[PDB]
Amino acid sequence: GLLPRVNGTPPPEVPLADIELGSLEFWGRDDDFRDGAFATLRREAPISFWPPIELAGLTAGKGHWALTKHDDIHFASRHPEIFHSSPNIVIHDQTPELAEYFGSMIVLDDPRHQRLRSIVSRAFTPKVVARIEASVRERAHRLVAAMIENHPDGQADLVSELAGPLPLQIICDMMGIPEEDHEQIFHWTNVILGFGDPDLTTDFDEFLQVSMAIGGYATALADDRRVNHHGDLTTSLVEAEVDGERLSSSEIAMFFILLVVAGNETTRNAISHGMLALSRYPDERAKWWSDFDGLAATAVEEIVRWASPVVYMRRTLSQDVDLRGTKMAAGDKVTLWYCSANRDEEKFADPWTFDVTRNPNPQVGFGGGGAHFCLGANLARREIRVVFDELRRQMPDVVATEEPARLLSQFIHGIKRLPVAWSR
Ligand code: HEM
Numbered sequence: 001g002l003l004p005r006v007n008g009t010p011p012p013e014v015p016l017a018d019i020e021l022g023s024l025e026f027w028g029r030d031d032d033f034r035d036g037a038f039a040t041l042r043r044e045a046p047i048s049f050w051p052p053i054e055l056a057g058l059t060a061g062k063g064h065w066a067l068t069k070h071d072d073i074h075f076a077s078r079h080p081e082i083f084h085s086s087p088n089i090v091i092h093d094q095t096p097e098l099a100e101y102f103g104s105m106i107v108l109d110d111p112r113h114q115r116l117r118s119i120v121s122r123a124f125t126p127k128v129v130a131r132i133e134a135s136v137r138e139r140a141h142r143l144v145a146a147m148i149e150n151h152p153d154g155q156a157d158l159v160s161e162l163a164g165p166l167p168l169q170i171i172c173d174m175m176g177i178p179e180e181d182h183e184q185i186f187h188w189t190n191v192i193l194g195f196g197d198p199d200l201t202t203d204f205d206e207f208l209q210v211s212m213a214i215g216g217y218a219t220a221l222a223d224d225r226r227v228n229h230h231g232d233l234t235t236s237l238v239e240a241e242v243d244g245e246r247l248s249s250s251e252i253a254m255f256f257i258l259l260v261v262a263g264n265e266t267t268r269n270a271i272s273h274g275m276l277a278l279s280r281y282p283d284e285r286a287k288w289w290s291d292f293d294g295l296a297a298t299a300v301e302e303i304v305r306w307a308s309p310v311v312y313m314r315r316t317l318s319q320d321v322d323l324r325g326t327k328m329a330a331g332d333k334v335t336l337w338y339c340s341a342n343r344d345e346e347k348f349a350d351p352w353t354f355d356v357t358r359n360p361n362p363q364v365g366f367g368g369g370g371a372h373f374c375l376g377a378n379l380a381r382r383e384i385r386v387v388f389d390e391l392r393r394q395m396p397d398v399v400a401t402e403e404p405a406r407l408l409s410q411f412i413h414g415i416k417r418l419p420v421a422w423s424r
Contacts, residue, residue, distance in 0.1 A: 001279035001400040008353040011036030016044050021066060022051035024198070027410050038340035041068045047326040052091050053410060055198070061092035064314065064333035065326070070344035070364065072323060073336045076315060077368030083315035083334060084109050085372060090411060091314050091335060101215070104251075104258035106372060113371065119247055120255060121375070123236035128174070131231060135173040136382050139166055140390040148394065148424075155401070158275055158418040159268065166387060167267040170379075171259050175221065176232030188214040189260045198408055211257070218253035263376050265412060266309040267383050270365075272404065272415035273307035274384060277354045279400035279420075284356045289392050299356035300384045305363035306354050308339040309413050313367065338364050339413065395422035 014036035020026045026037070041048065046069045054060040067073050076083045086109045088099045099107050105116045140162075147161045168189060172182055188210040194200045195207045225235040226249075237252050247255075278285040288299050312335045321328045328334065341364045343351045348361075366374035374380070391398050401421045407414025 068340040070341035074368040077370040104255040123240040140387045144390045163271040167264045174233040215253040218256040219249040222249040222252040269309040274303035304365040398422035
């Protein structure tokens with residue numbers, strides 16, 4: 001909240017010769033500089049080739065074509081046969097023998113992708129979903145109420161106390177994980193998530209051990225449900241079937257490992273950026289708090305467009321492609337910069353305005369559409385809606401009180417800490 005900002009302010013004009021998408025220094029600049037770089041790219045070099053970020057001492061891989069236009073990103077997403085998701089969806093995979101272990105369906109192309117996603121989807125039965133919906137409400141209500149008891153001074157970090165724990169507690173609830181086990185699930189998850197942070201010194205040996213441990217935890221959980229039926233997603237996964245194919249315990253473990261990353265830190269960063277935007281632009285909070293259920297759908301969609309928690313996804317070309325007269329070769333990597341498509345001057349009027357009533361809103365924060373479209377998009381929209389509903393009811397004047405501590409990442413639009421304050 002700290003620095004005053006006027007809703008609708010465009011980014012500074014960033015000279016093309018100043019943009020270094022392969023430098024880590026670039027990803028450390030503030031959001032205005034980044035938004036201004038991509039604005040320059042959309043105008044002057046909308047498809048361009050970049051080397052990967054190189055951490056001195058480690059293999060970096062080959063470079064990538066940056067797609068910065070909403071129409072280009074949509075096209076790529078609609079043609080998975082040309083733009084493959086296998087081998088992986090990050091610029092450079094550091095553990096390629098474990099690509100499928102961590103990635104589950106997101107690193108598969110068809111037909112393997114559709115087969116797996118079909119079986120996983122059918123496990124989300126009406127009963128399992130109704131339990132998830134009660135969990136979202138219960139968990140958000142308890143976490144906000146805990147912030148109030150744990151902080152008589154009326155100050156806390158939104159990330160550690162709410163935005164961090166809510167998405168993971170909800171994943172634990174749908175898997176049927178006991179309360180007692182959360183500590184270990186959280187510690188393992190945090191170590192996995194930390195392995196990308198260059199402000200942390202995370203041991204690769206430790207990363208492997210926690211990765212195997214959470215996977216062994218998950219296969220044992222699924223095996224328990226094979227003998228003991230419960231009303232949880234774990235049991236629905238072991239029982240689900242499509243054309244006679246069922247899921248092994250290892251496949252369920254890999255999907256769980258994907259959830260505690262892809263379904264977790266994404267939602268966390270949508271919540272934190274949503275809090276930050278509602279703090280910077282208080283008229284939007286006032287409007288939202290005045291008609292909460294009636295503006296919730298457009299408000300949530302704008303929080304996702306604004307936050308773009310997933311900054312990009314990578315693809316790999318199976319054949320040559322010429323689009324916008326830019327020739328890209330089979331085998332090249334391509335990156336889909338959702339953070340740029342969600343400011344594309346050709347799709348959104350007033351793109352620099354955070355508008356909780358915005359409509360239409362063809363935002364691509366859940367991806368550009370198609371085969372890999374976020375499996376949890378409606379679950380994420382619900383988590384966002386419900387957490388701000390509980391803040392609105394319990395501490396309506398809560399506001400960010402400091403600029404965020406930002407995660408240094410090319411992939412995740414991360415907030416590490418976000419101080420907030422409220423009154424009673
Ligand atoms: C604001 C929150 C979230 C954002 C921004 C987000 C974004 C994304 C994106 C960009 C993709 C790739 C889309 C593509 O390649 O076309 C994806 C896929 C996926 N997401 Fe989400 N996600 C969010 C929350 C969630 C949640 C809550 C869940 C479930 C708990 C989830 C589960 C998945 C799965 C399983 C996939 C893989 C689908 C596939 O490969 O077919 N995500 N998500």
